[PDB]
Amino acid sequence: SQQFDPYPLAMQFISQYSPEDIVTAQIEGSSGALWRISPPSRAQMKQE
Amino acid sequence: QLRREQVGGTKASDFLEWWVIELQDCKADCNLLPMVIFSD
Amino acid sequence: SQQFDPYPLAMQFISQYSPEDIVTAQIEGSSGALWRISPPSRAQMKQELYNGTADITLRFTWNFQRDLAKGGTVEYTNEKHTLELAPNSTARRQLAQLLEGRPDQSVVIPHLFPKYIRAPNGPEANPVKQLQPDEEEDYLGVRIQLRREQVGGTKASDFLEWWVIELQDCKADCNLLPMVIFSD
């Protein structure tokens, strides 16, 4: 709320929601799986 | 970004690939992307 | 409509639907992903495909996801076409040969790809009974093939495999399979 306090529309929107009703999703960036693509489709990707 | 890892021969298929994405302006949690969502 | 104009049942069925209510799904044939199977399970596949006694099944399943914001309750409509393979028949032996690593071997499974499908408001995307009266001989055939790519040692696990399927009678769009579906 402090971060978005100057703005009126943002402030009313955030005020509308309870604190235990908003969640932060800490999606990992690097923790992915192997990229699986057939070599022909990857070559076509690069060429296109 | 794309990460490679040699295994082992064909050139491009010769080794493992995966993808790493990170936020544009990251200081210390570069390996993490927050996403705030409001659920009614 | 012109293509199916002589037939009465087909003509009434097509007339029933609006032109902006039927869609063609240009599912790609060759643009697949790597076939991932554990080496023991692939070896067991090949061995059971050669020296098997019980018939082995082979199923082709379609599944349509429709937008749920337009009303309607069921959100997925799916159905499968199951084809049996009797032991030592030509197709099963052909597949067992296919897994051997031949460079340009191919197999043809007759009557597997139902071209015209219907997607009702229920979870049964049955193939149109009418446009394909035979219901088993009107299904298109599918040419299956396996592609290898050397990497690099164990022989069979030494290199990448994926599968490419294409329509039985293809002239220029061989890398594409159309699938016309009527949605109520």
Q: Phi and psi of C59, rounded to 5°?
A: -115, 150
Do residues C180 and C63 make contact, with C-beta atoms less than 8 angstroms apart?
A: no
Taking an 8 Å cut-off on Cβ atoms, the answer to whether A28 and B30 are in contact is no
Which residues of B have a CB under 8 Å from any CB of C?
Answer: 7-10, 13-14
Taking an 8 Å cut-off on Cβ atoms, the answer to whether A41 and C31 are in contact is yes
Note the residue count of chain A.
Answer: 48
Residues of B in contact with A15 (CB under 8 A): none
The SS3 call for residue A43 is helix
Instruction: Locate C50 and state its tokens.
Output: 């050669």
Which residues of A have a CB under 8 Å from any CB of B?
Answer: 17, 21-35, 39, 42-43
Q: Given a contact as 3+ CB pairs under 8 Å, which chains touch A? A: B, C
- Separation of alpha carbons C139 and C100, rounded Å: 28
Q: What is the residue whose two structure tokens read 């999703």?
A: A25
Cα–Cα–Cα angle for C130, C134, C136, nearest 5°? 115
Residues of A in contact with C30 (CB under 8 A): 38, 40-41
Q: Which among B12, B23, B36 is the nearest to A22, CB-wise?
A: B36
The H or E element containing residue B29 is none
Residues of C in contact with A41 (CB under 8 A): 30-32
Which residues of B have a CB under 8 Å from any CB of A?
Answer: 2, 10, 12-13, 16-23, 30-40
Cα–Cα–Cα angle for A40, A42, A45, nearest 5°? 110
Q: What is the DSSP string of C53-113?
A: -S-EEEEEEEEEE--STTS-S--EEEEEEEEEE-TT-HHHHHHHHHTT--SS--EEEEEEE
Do residues C161 and C34 make contact, with C-beta atoms less than 8 angstroms apart?
A: yes
- Separation of alpha carbons B30 and C32, rounded Å: 33
Q: CA end-to-end span of chain B, whole Å?
A: 35
Residues of B in contact with A33 (CB under 8 A): 18
